[PDB]
């Protein structure tokens, strides 16, 4: 029964006090690690005899990776005494926060066990990148947060049918601007994945005006993106949002009815 | 019966497992064809003595003729089954889906009669922008867009009055902004007509930055712009969603209805 | 009993077909004025021996105005019947459509009787401005033009308020982002009325570009200033929707239940 | 009973001539105070013999001076007034309309101990800015600022979770924006906090183009982005717009009930 105690204690924090504390060091060395990861990419102005400036995650490299290694093993053996702890390993390993939880913490071994080519991009980049798949470890601490996650999945027929609209309407908008608009001088519309950019950025209504029609037909069409796009995002939108509120209202209920 | 027997395996894809297949083969040269219509436009770098870039659809004309003439008849052989194969072939010619489908088509033969004259462009652009129609074939195979477009011909009488009241705050602001802007220095308001794009962006909060007013007036006249541009376009989006979402719960209620 | 069987004819168009004549003839007369006031500034080219472009409404500025004076005269004669022909002609010339056939009339003979100084600008391009509002008189035409001038009406609490805290929210960023952008180089925060500018671009969600922050401060409250015009225009526009949507289907209850 | 006499006129102004005058000058006073702020940022163009333009408030400084202190005094005399002569006085101090009194009153005399230093900005500015929150005062005045404040505080629980999520979502795609534009030439994401400008500019669909996209991956996911926050920002405003609407109807019923 040790390991059923140990997981009504990971699983509802307000219970012991042991619980809460692991709970909130937990949350505190989530934060921790997300602002050092934001903070190393800052340049630390000049150095003493520097030619450029340097990011505060190179010119103190040491600190920030001690940093990130005990952010990590503080991860990981927290996710290995909830595997090793849960009645059923099988429905932890296959839970949601689960796989939110080795995506973030594989990252750094990944990175360890590629030490020997790390001034090369590439791969790297793509695990700093990774690094910030921590930050969805808050679902864990927030409870909005899975609200949210609860209602994405809710509404995941209504988000795959905004995706396809959207897909449609910048590809007819895209074709029709770019054959409108290849013909400008110095013309941006170089080609039908070009104009992919300016659809999406209009029909978002963004206007950057990094690309901007030039002729006539391209402002006419580009006028019907904007409107076309206005009206296909706001299609999914009200029932998100009803879904959204239902959530809430729905754990509000819950939690007045328990409570 | 062999016609309407046909009709059932055209209207309903999930009745045979030929009627099945010949439904996925449609869906997937219409994809096929999408991409490659969006591709061809794509620079394929430098060639081996090219003085410049060359686009996929111009470096190898004759494999993507091949893919679209491939395409076309794939299309048109579908249309012909369609139409010989029909109950009422008055009522099938003039439903929607028979009009996109002659429109998909159709370009395909024109451009082969034109064959004489194909470096010239005008009627080569057009006909290259109403190739992206074949896109319009996929709202056979999404139900979704066949609910888009129930709904935009539930609201044509607002989409009309929101057209209407579009054209009439483009005049008056583009009317307002040339007079309050015809006078500064390189001035891109250079009449009312030229004002309708400024107008047309600021009601729309895109924002592109191209036409930025200059003086007092125009400062204030854009601000107004803005806001009534707001206003203007929220008054038959909310009556758009009621419809869309009609429709898809009326579905919703009949699928479980019948199932 | 003909000056109310004239009042009947032009308050209720189809009950007559003189009656219709008359209603369309004058929708034409407004539409030709209206266009033609937009064309004229369109420029023609180049003459021969022109040095530079001339509108459509200086090459040939004596069509324009046989056009615009026969409008006028169309435009008056109908007030003229409407005035004389009315059974209370107090109530008539205090009800709005009066005053906007006087203001897209008067215009026109301010002008005649400023003959003699006609070169010169300022109450020239504000009576140029003022020929606008005879697109007003498509409001006789439209029925959801109608609709929306009595949401307007309805509304006006709810507009007042919001252009009080709009107001509000303007003086309070315009302030904050002048005092913490006055200090950037070539900065175009020269003033509180120069950031009015760009609070109010900002907060409908604009983004013109042409001032942009260059400060840590300036970012932090431009980002502050976005979210918060969103929220402070958004609490109006609800109530609008629901008056305008109210008006319409009050209209159409009352189309069927006498109809 | 002299000083509850005071407070019920205080409290409610429309009970006597005395109180109802002494309301409309505070209110007067209130607003000339903040033009003349928002006005000595002006320039007054060029004096006589002056090599730039100096603003209203530094040619005419002793004018504003006078303008500013008699604002002040009146001000503080009335929150003298209002402190003095209430029944409970830790109550009023502690209610929000005296914070913001004493907000506004307060940096003017920390001006005045300050004379000695004034030509160093830094806290300067800080008084300068917070001179503003004297436009606060008028929601002593105007009803439907008390609802907005209202609604502001019922939706505290909220516009905490809209934070929340803005501030991960703010993390998450300014991290991935930095690591796919890093490289670019003059680019622009020189660092995380950095790419927060771009993200919460495109979040909002403001774009002001000063910071866009310039590869592949920098447009993939600037679109996701602008996607992402508009159905980030639209959960919690439907909720806070439900209170407002709510606050602002039940006071309806309220004046209803009452009168
Ligand atoms: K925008
Ligand atoms: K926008
Ligand atoms: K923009
Ligand atoms: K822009």
Avoid at 4 to 26: G, I, K
Avoid at 52 to 74: H, N, Q, S, W
Avoid at 87 to 100: D, E, K, L, N
Wanted: glycine share 6%; proline share 4%.
């Amino acid at each position: 029964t040790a390991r059923q105690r140990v997981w009504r204690a990971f699983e509802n924090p307000h219970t012991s006090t042991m619980a809460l504390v692991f709970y909130y060091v937990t949350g505190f060395f989530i934060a921790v690690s997300v602002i050092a990861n934001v903070v190393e990419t800052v340049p630390c102005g000049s150095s003493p005899g520097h030619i450029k400036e340097l990011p505060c995650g190179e010119r103190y490299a040491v600190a920030f990776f001690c940093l990130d290694t005990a952010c990590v093993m503080i991860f990981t053996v927290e996710y290995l005494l909830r595997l090793a702890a849960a009645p059923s390993r099988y429905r932890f390993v296959r839970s949601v926060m689960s796989i939110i939880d080795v995506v973030a913490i594989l990252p750094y071994y990944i990175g360890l066990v590629m030490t020997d080519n790390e001034d090369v991009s590439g791969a790297f980049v793509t695990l700093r990148v990774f690094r910030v798949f921590r930050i969805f470890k808050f679902s864990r601490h927030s409870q909005g947060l899975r609200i949210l996650g609860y209602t994405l999945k809710s509404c995941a027929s209504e988000l795959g049918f905004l995706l396809f609209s959207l897909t449609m309407a910048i590809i007819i908008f895209a074709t029709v601007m770019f054959y409108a608009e290849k013909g400008s001088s110095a013309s941006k519309f170089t080609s039908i994945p070009a104009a992919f950019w300016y659809t999406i950025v209009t029909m978002t209504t963004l206007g950057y005006g990094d690309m901007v029609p030039k002729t006539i037909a391209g402002k006419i069409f580009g006028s019907i993106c904007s409107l076309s796009g206005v009206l296909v995002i706001a299609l999914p939108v009200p029932v998100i949002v009803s879904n959204f509120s239902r959530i809430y209202h729905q754990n509000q209920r819950a939690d007045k009815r328990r409570a």
